[PDB]
């Protein structure tokens, strides 16, 4: 990690809870029947969902903060360029595609939902992307191949390209980074789209997140403060797991596979990294389910 020191890290390291397998069928049967119902489908992503491609989490039993309370460095089995995305950020992508997910709010930084194919235009990313760096003057993204080289909203040394003055100059304003330091304000932008999206959701599904961020972990409130359904979705404890109309208890790639499994939905194979700006229009919406034995 190279943003600042900081005290208040939240609960690292609390122990993971597996529900028993006729709980657990059950469960996902009915987060299946709510996906295939509701109007208005918002996800909640975190580090949960990239752990089965190799890059830690932050509070859980070997987090980056689970391990810095120790002095230790955490494992990482990908660089951000060679992650893959998993069967959850596939399976996502098929739910975006089918008509099944109104928006998508991560707190990830690795970069992975815009390289699996989601599209932009339905994507916040609240707290950066390793990715992506940002025009100071003009605002204009950048998404990039390759990692932008900083953290913390510091210049990455490239200057903005964008035409102006007829197409007589480029923009030249100073690009930098995206990746929030500690208390750094979240984008006005991609906050704003997921507190609406959020505040107008019939089901908020939250995914590998243990919710302790805030204003972030408290978006899928405004659901349930509306009358919607929310679910929670994580091997620890959350912080707002009293608030949830339905608790899942597992790996996440195993519910999401089920749960795509139940919606009659084949979860697509990644085919390298992507970059989709606005959403191509939906393919047809699938066959009715067939309900649980
Ligand atoms: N395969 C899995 N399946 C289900 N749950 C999982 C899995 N792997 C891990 N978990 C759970 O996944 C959860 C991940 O919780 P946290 O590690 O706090 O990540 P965040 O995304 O909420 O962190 C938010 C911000 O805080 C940071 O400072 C950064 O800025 C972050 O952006 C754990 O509770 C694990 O039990
Ligand atoms: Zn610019």
Redesign the pocket.
Same mark, same amino acid.
């Given at each position: 990690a190279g943003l600042s020191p900081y005290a208040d890290k939240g609960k690292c390291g609390l122990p993971?809870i597996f529900d028993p397998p006729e709980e657990l069928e059950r469960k996902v049967w009915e987060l299946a029947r709510l996906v295939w119902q509701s109007s208005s489908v918002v996800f909640h992503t975190?580090?949960?969902i990239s752990?089965?491609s190799g890059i830690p989490?932050?509070?859980?039993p070997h987090?980056v903060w689970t391990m810095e309370e120790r002095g230790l460095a955490p494992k990482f089995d990908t660089t951000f360029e060679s992650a893959r995305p998993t069967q959850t950020h596939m399976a996502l992508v098929q739910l975006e595609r089918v008509g099944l997910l109104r928006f998508l709010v991560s @707190?990830?930084?690795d970069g992975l939902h815009v390289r699996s194919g989601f599209p932009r235009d339905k994507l916040a990313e609240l707290?950066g992307n390793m990715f992506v760096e940002e025009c100071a003057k003009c605002k204009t993204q950048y998404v990039r191949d390759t990692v932008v080289g900083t953290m913390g909203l510091k210049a990455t040394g490239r200057l903005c390209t964008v035409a102006k003055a007829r197409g007589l100059r480029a923009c030249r304003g100073e690009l930098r980074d995206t990746i929030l330091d500690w208390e750094d304000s979240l984008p006005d932008r991609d906050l704003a789209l997921a507190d609406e999206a959020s505040r107008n959701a019939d089901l908020s599904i939250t995914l590998?997140?243990?919710?302790?961020?805030r204003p972030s972990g408290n978006l899928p409130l405004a659901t349930k403060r509306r009358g919607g359904r929310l679910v929670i979705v994580?091997? @620890?404890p959350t912080k707002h797991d009293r608030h949830a109309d339905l608790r899942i208890h597992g790996?996440?790639?195993e519910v999401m596979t089920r749960l795509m499994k139940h919606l009659g939905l084949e979860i697509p194979a990644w085919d390298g990294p992507r970059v989709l700006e606005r959403a191509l229009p939906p393919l047809p919406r699938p066959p009715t389910p067939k309900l649980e034995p």
């Open positions: 993971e975190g580090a949960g752990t089965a989490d932050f509070r859980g987090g @707190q990830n930084v707290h590998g997140t243990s919710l302790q961020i994580n091997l @620890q790996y996440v790639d």
